[PDB]
Amino acid sequence: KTWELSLYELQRTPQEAITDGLEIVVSPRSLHSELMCPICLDMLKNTMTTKECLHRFCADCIITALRSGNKECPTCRKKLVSKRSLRPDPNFDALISKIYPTTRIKITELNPHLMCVLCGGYFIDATTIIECLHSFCKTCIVRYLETSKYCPICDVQVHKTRPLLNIRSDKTLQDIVYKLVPGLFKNEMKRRRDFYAAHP
Ligand SMILES: [Zn+2]
Ligand SMILES: [Zn+2]
Ligand SMILES: [Zn+2]
Ligand SMILES: [Zn+2]
């Protein structure tokens, strides 16, 4: 895939964090499409992630379907490499252990799981390194990988030559951010509209 950054993506401004503690509500019916396992229909327990498509399942659930199936992804029906294609998602389990309830949550407890260490703000076009499952903004990690072939956090090697081969868009994670953070999807889409209304 061409990781070309648009005119907006080159001059993109971070989405600043909301330090002033706001409490957001989380219903069990909402946030259901991203936190439930599409095999057991329960919330993810010991989350596993596919390197080819970034789809999350339970550790016991995905292992069951692979030993008795076509070694495909149960969601997108893409071909696996049968083994060493599944890496556990530890930072995803931490996010699950924060939001399993039906009460309201302080955003300051959720910010570590929704912020990019490269821009210092919320995730916009969340991209994930499929080797260590560390997520950043699309503009941040692509801008970053022009100079380094290693992860900004755990410092593992992304790829031997072309680091863009081992990154992938994390649509499931980005959908959690736009739903948790109020008005983020509205502000981010207006930022793009204001830019293209002044640079036609
Ligand atoms: Zn499951
Ligand atoms: Zn998949
Ligand atoms: Zn960023
Ligand atoms: Zn990493």
Side-chain angles (χ1 to χ4, degrees), residues 149 157 159-163 165:
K149 289 184 276 291
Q157 194 175 32
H159 192 269
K160 329 175 190 194
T161 58
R162 299 146 62 187
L165 264 47

Side-chain angles (χ1 to χ4, degrees), residues 37 39-42 57-58 61:
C37 169
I39 290 185
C40 65
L41 300 168
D42 192 64
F57 313 92
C58 296
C61 288

Side-chain angles (χ1 to χ4, degrees), residues 32-35 37-77 79-170 172-195:
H32 216 62
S33 316
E34 313 85 12
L35 311 184
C37 169
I39 290 185
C40 65
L41 300 168
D42 192 64
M43 264 215 183
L44 297 169
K45 41 198 294 176
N46 282 5
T47 306
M48 281 279 145
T49 315
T50 58
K51 285 173 50 175
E52 294 86 351
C53 41
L54 294 183
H55 281 128
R56 281 88 178 185
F57 313 92
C58 296
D60 310 71
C61 288
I62 187 60
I63 287 187
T64 298
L66 291 189
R67 263 221 263 268
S68 314
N70 295 90
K71 268 68 174 179
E72 300 174 336
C73 179
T75 303
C76 70
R77 198 163 63 77
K79 217 201 266 166
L80 261 81
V81 193
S82 181
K83 62 187 68 191
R84 186 199 287 287
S85 274
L86 314 177
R87 194 196 174 280
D89 218 338
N91 296 345
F92 211 88
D93 287 329
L95 184 59
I96 292 301
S97 294
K98 293 276 186 59
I99 202 178
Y100 47 90
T102 287
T103 322
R104 44 181 101 240
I105 298 264
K106 264 182 163 289
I107 54 180
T108 55
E109 282 245 342
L110 300 181
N111 280 11
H113 315 279
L114 309 178
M115 297 204 312
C116 171
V117 303
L118 302 170
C119 68
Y122 284 135
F123 283 138
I124 297 299
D125 293 329
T127 306
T128 296
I129 305 179
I130 60 182
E131 282 294 327
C132 49
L133 299 192
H134 272 127
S135 308
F136 320 89
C137 301
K138 171 188 173 181
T139 71
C140 297
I141 183 58
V142 166
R143 223 187 181 196
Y144 167 89
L145 287 171
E146 286 193 350
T147 69
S148 175
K149 289 184 276 291
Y150 299 80
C151 174
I153 307 175
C154 61
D155 213 61
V156 307
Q157 194 175 32
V158 186
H159 192 269
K160 329 175 190 194
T161 58
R162 299 146 62 187
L164 301 188
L165 264 47
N166 286 9
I167 63 169
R168 213 134 304 184
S169 290
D170 204 328
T172 296
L173 175 62
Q174 186 64 65
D175 274 51
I176 303 176
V177 185
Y178 283 150
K179 290 182 185 174
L180 288 178
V181 185
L184 179 62
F185 183 83
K186 301 175 189 174
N187 185 18
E188 178 59 34
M189 291 312 167
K190 220 198 93 173
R191 285 190 177 186
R192 299 178 177 177
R193 280 187 258 110
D194 305 325
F195 176 77

